[PDB]
Design a protein around this ligand. Structure first.
Ligand SMILES: Nc1nc2c(c(=O)[nH]1)N[C@H]1C(S)=C(S)[C@@H](COP(=O)(O)OP(=O)(O)OC[C@H]3O[C@@H](n4cnc5c(=O)[nH]c(N)nc54)[C@H](O)[C@@H]3O)O[C@H]1N2
Ligand SMILES: Nc1nc2c(c(=O)[nH]1)N[C@H]1C(S)=C(S)[C@@H](COP(=O)(O)OP(=O)(O)OC[C@H]3O[C@@H](n4cnc5c(=O)[nH]c(N)nc54)[C@H](O)[C@@H]3O)O[C@H]1N2
Ligand code: SF4
Ligand SMILES: O=N[O-]
Ligand SMILES: [Mo+6]
Length: 715
C-alpha cells in the first residue's frame, strides 16, 4: 500500500495531501506536512478525491473523444486519430482562411498543472500564431493584477501566506477566508492568536468577522467611499509614513486632494458606517507596526474594481506596509492553479514568467527557442469577450480547455449563443459538463490523480504534485492532446513527461529558472522569483524589498470618486443580489459534486442567504423554495432565513446547475481588465406558495439535466 504526495486541487491554499493508494486505486486522502497546511486539510481536500472514480452522482467522467458532426445534435464517440485530425484540420482551415486571431484558446486553473498551461500558450503562439490565450484570471483577479501592476508593478500576492501569522493587523477586506481558503483562515486566526488585531470589511457577518476587533459592515458597493475616508484620516491625523511615502512613492499630492474631500462625516450614509468607526479603522490600520491587506472578490467583481484595488494599495503605500515581511498587499488568488496559469502565460499579453509579448527582446527569445520566425506582438482576445467576438465573427473557433463557461460565465445565455455562433467549439475536459455538452468536439484528459506536474499556491509558491493512479481509459494528458494537434498541424511537438516542459520553461523564464523539480521536491514550496538552481536560493517570500518593479522604481498612488454599481435598484426590486460561494462545494461542482461525502451535504437547487428581520416581512421562511427574477433571467432556490446576510441584500452562489445564480447576472465587464460585476445584481425574491409543487420542480429539472449530460457522456 503506498502514499503518493499531491497538492489539493481545490482552493489556492495549496495544501499538500498524501493519497494512499492500495492495489491500483486511491483509497484515502490525508494531510501531508506541506508548508501552508502542516497536517491539516478542510472537508474538501479530505473527502473530495473520489471524483476520479467516475461516481456519476452528477456527471459521468469523459471516457472517449466525441464529435458532433451536425449542429442538430448528437455527440457520438470517435477515436483519437479521428478527433485529433478533425481539430488540426479544422483549426488549420479556419487559420489560413481567416488568420490566426480567428481562433481563441484557454489555459486552465484546475488539475492540469503549470506544465500544460505553458504548453497551451506555446501552441497558440508558435503553432496557430496568436496571442489568444486566456484563463479565469479574467473573471477573478484580473482587476487585481491591473491595479496592482500599475501601483506596485506586480499583481501577485505581495507577501506570503505563511507570513500572515506575524502581522500586527489582518486587514481582511471584502474577502471570506473561512469559506474560501480554510487553511488561509487558519493562518489569520493564528495571527489573531499571536496577538494580531483583525478588521473585517464585509457587508455580511462572515464567520471571520466574529473573531475581529472591528466589523465595518459597509453598504454593498461602497468600497471607495469607505476607502477614501480612511485615507482622509491617515492624512488628516498625520498618521502616514512620510519617509516611506516621500522616498518610495509617486502621486501622493494628487491622492491627498481627493481624500481631503471624502471626510468620515460626508460618508456615513453611503458606507452605512459611522464616521467614528471609519476613523477608528483608519487609525487602527495605520497604527499597526505591520498591517497586511488580504482581499478577494468583494473587490475585484465590481466594475470600479481596478480602482478599489489601486485604492487599497494606496493605504498600504501611505502606511509603509510594503517591502517588509508580515505586511503588504494580498489578493488571495482563487482556484488551486489560477495563479499558475498566469505564471505560465495563459494570459493574452504575457509569455510565461511574466514576459509581455509587446517587448521585442522577449519575442526574439521565444521565437528563437520555438524555432519560429515571428511571434505575434499584439494582445490576444481576452476569453471574456468571446461572445462579442463570436457574434462579430471576429473569432470562429474556441479551443476551451479545462473550463466550464456555460455554467460559470456571467449572463450564461450569452455564453450559450456564443457557442451557437462559433464555427467550431472544442472542449477538453474531464467531466461531461454543461459546456462539454454543447461542444462540437470533445477530448478527454487525465484527472488530477492520474497525472503530475507543478501548481502555484496563492502566494507565488510552486509545489509539486505526483501521479497516484493510472487512468481507466484511453486518456492523454492535456499536454499530449495539444502536442499531438500541434504536430498534426505541422509544428513538431512531443514531451516525454511534464519535467521536460518545466525545464524548457525554466530556460525561458529567468524568475522560474532556480525552481527545479529537485528543489520543489515532495514538500518544498518555492515562491518565485527563484533565480538560481542553487539550493541557497529557496525563493522570494515577500516582494518589493529594494525597488517596486514599476518602470521607475516608485509605487504609484491612486484613487477616484466613489461610483455606484451598474444595475440600479428599483422600488420593485429593492434587494441586492451579491454572488458568492459556499464551503463544501467548489465552483463548477463537477469534481466536488461528484464526490460522495460532499454531494451528501448539499445538492440542488442551492441556498439564498435571506435576512431575518426582513424575511418576516416578505413571507419567506427558512428552507422554502423561493424565486428570484432578473433582467437576465429568473432563478428558483431554497431560501435560508438568518441574521447573517445584510438586511437589504441577499447572497447566492454559482456552484449549482439548477438554481444557477449566474443565469441572472449581467456581464458588466470592467472597462479595464474586462471583468464581471457578479457582486451586484438587482433581484426580486418572491415567495413560493405551493412548495410541494416546487419541490417536484427542483427535482424534475435536476433529474432532466443529469440524464441529459449522462446520455451524451455514455452515448
Ligand atoms: N469553499 C469554496 N472555496 C472557494 C471556492 C469555492 O467554490 N468553494 N472558490 C474559489 C475561487 S474561484 C475564488 S476567486 C475565491 C473567492 O473567495 P472570496 O474572495 O472570499 O470571494 P466571495 O466569497 O465571492 O466574496 C468575498 C466577500 O466580499 C463581500 N462583499 C460583497 N460586496 C462587497 C462590497 O461592496 N464591499 C466589500 N468590502 N465586500 C463586499 C461578500 O459579502 C463576500 O463575503 O473562493 C475560492 N475558494
Ligand atoms: N455568480 C458568480 N459566478 C462566478 C463567480 C462568482 O463569485 N459569482 N466566481 C467566478 C470565478 S472567481 C471563477 S474562478 C469561475 C470558475 O471558472 P470555471 O471554469 O467554472 O472553473 P471550474 O469550476 O473549476 O471548472 C473547471 C473545469 O475543469 C475541468 N477539469 C478539472 N481538472 C481538469 C484537468 O486536469 N483537465 C481538463 N481538461 N479539465 C479538467 C472540470 O471537470 C471542469 O469542467 O467561476 C466564476 N463565476
Ligand atoms: S480546498 Fe483548500 S483549504 Fe481545503 S484542503 Fe484544498 S487546498 Fe487546503
Ligand atoms: O483569479 N483567481 O481565481
Ligand atoms: Mo476565482
Amino acid at each position: 500500500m503506498k502514499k503518493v504526495v499531491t497538492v489539493c486541487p481545490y482552493c489556492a491554499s495549496g495544501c499538500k495531501i498524501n493519497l494512499v493508494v492500495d492495489n491500483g486505486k486511491i483509497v484515502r486522502a490525508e494531510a501531508a506536512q506541506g508548508k501552508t497546511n502542516q497536517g491539516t486539510l478542510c472537508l474538501k481536500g479530505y473527502y473530495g478525491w473520489d471524483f476520479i472514480n467516475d461516481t456519476q452522482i452528477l456527471t459521468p467522467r469523459l471516457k472517449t473523444p466525441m464529435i458532433r458532426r451536425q449542429r442538430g445534435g448528437k455527440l457520438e464517440p470517435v477515436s483519437w486519430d479521428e478527433a485529433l485530425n478533425y481539430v488540426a484540420e479544422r483549426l488549420s482551415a479556419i487559420k489560413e482562411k481567416y488568420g490566426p486571431d480567428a481562433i481563441q484558446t484557454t489555459g486552465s486553473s484546475r488539475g492540469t498543472g503549470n506544465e500544460t498551461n505553458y504548453v497551451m500558450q506555446k501552441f497558440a503562439r508558435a503553432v496557430i500564431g496568436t496571442n489568444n490565450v486566456d484563463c479565469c484570471a479574467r473573471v477573478x483577479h484580473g482587476p487585481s493584477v491591473a491595479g496592482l501592476h500599475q501601483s506596485v508593478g506586480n499583481g501577485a500576492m505581495s507577501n506570503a501566506i505563511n507570513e500572515i501569522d506575524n502581522t500586527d493587523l489582518v486587514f481582511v477586506f471584502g474577502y471570506n477566508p473561512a469559506d474560501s481558503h480554510p487553511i488561509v483562515a487558519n493562518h489569520v486566526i493564528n495571527a489573531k492568536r499571536n496577538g494580531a488585531k483583525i478588521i473585517v470589511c464585509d457587508p455580511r457577518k462572515i464567520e471571520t468577522a466574529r473573531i475581529a476587533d472591528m466589523h465595518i459592515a459597509l453598504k454593498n458597493g461602497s468600497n471607495i467611499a469607505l476607502l477614501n475616508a480612511m485615507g482622509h484620516v491617515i492624512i488628516e491625523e498625520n498618521l502616514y509614513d512620510k519617509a516611506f511615502v516621500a522616498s518610495r512613492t509617486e502621486g501622493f499630492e494628487e491622492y491627498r486632494k481627493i481624500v481631503e474631500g471624502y471626510t468620515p462625516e460626508s460618508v456615513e450614509d453611503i458606507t452605512g458606517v459611522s464616521a467614528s468607526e471609519i476613523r477608528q479603522a483608519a487609525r487602527m490600520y495605520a497604527q499597526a507596526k505591520s498591517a497586511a491587506i488580504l482581499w478577494g472578490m468583494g473587490v475585484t467583481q465590481f466594475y470600479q474594481g481596478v480602482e478599489t484595488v489601486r485604492s487599497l494599495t494606496s493605504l498600504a503605500m501611505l502606511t509603509g506596509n510594503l517591502g517588509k515581511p508580515h505586511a503588504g498587499v494580498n489578493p488571495v488568488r482563487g482556484q488551486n492553479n489560477v495563479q499558475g496559469a498566469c505564471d505560465m502565460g495563459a494570459l493574452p499579453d504575457t509569455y510565461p514568467g511574466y514576459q509581455y509579448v509587446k517587448d521585442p527582446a522577449n519575442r526574439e527569445k521565444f521565437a528563437k527557442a520555438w524555432g519560429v520566425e515571428s511571434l505575434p506582438a499584439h494582445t490576444g482576445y481576452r476569453i471574456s469577450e468571446l461572445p462579442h467576438r463570436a457574434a462579430h465573427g471576429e473569432v470562429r473557433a474556441a479551443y476551451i480547455m479545462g473550463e466550464d463557461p456555460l455554467q460559470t460565465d456571467a449572463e450564461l445565455s450569452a455564453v450559450r449563443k456564443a457557442f451557437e455562433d462559433l464555427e467550431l467549439v472544442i472542449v477538453q475536459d474531464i467531466f461531461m459538463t454543461k459546456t462539454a455538452s454543447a461542444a462540437d468536439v470533445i477530448l478527454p484528459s487525465t484527472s488530477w490523480g492520474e497525472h503530475e506536474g507543478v501548481f502555484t499556491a496563492a502566494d507565488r509558491g510552486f509545489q509539486r504534485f505526483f501521479k497516484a493512479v493510472e487512468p481507466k481509459w484511453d486518456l492523454k494528458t492535456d499536454w499530449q492532446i495539444i502536442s499531438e494537434i500541434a504536430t498534426r498541424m505541422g509544428y513538431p511537438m512531443h514531451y516525454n513527461n511534464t519535467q521536460e516542459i518545466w525545464d524548457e520553461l525554466r530556460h525561458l523564464c529567468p524568475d522560474f529558472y532556480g525552481a527545479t523539480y529537485e528543489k520543489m521536491g515532495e514538500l518544498g514550496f518555492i515562491q518565485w522569483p527563484c533565480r538560481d538552481t542553487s539550493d541557497a536560493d529557496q525563493g522570494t517570500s515577500y516582494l518589493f524589498k529594494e525597488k517596486f518593479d514599476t518602470p521607475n522604481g516608485l509605487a504609484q498612488f491612486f484613487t477616484c470618486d466613489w461610483v455606484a454599481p451598474i444595475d440600479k435598484l428599483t422600488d420593485e426590486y429593492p434587494m441586492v443580489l451579491s454572488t458568492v460561494r459556499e464551503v463544501g462545494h467548489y465552483s463548477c461542482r463537477s469534481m466536488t459534486g461528484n464526490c460522495a461525502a460532499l454531494a451528501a451535504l448539499a445538492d440542488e437547487p442551492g441556498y439564498a442567504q435571506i435576512n431575518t428581520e426582513d424575511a418576516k416581512r416578505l413571507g419567506i421562511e427558512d428552507e422554502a423554495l423561493v424565486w428570484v427574477h432578473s433582467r437576465k433571467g429568473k432563478i428558483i432556490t431554497r431560501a435560508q432565513v438568518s441574521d447573517r446576510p445584510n438586511k437589504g441584500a441577499i447572497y447566492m452562489t454559482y456552484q449549482w446547475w439548477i438554481g444557477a445564480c449566474n443565469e441572472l447576472v449581467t456581464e458588466n465587464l470592467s472597462p479595464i481588465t474586462k471583468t464581471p460585476e457578479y457582486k451586484y445584481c438587482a433581484v426580486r425574491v418572491e415567495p413560493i406558495a405551493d412548495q410541494r409543487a416546487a419541490e417536484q420542480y427542483v427535482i424534475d429539472e435536476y433529474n432532466k439535466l443529469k440524464t441529459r449530460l449522462r446520455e451524451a457522456a455514455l452515448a
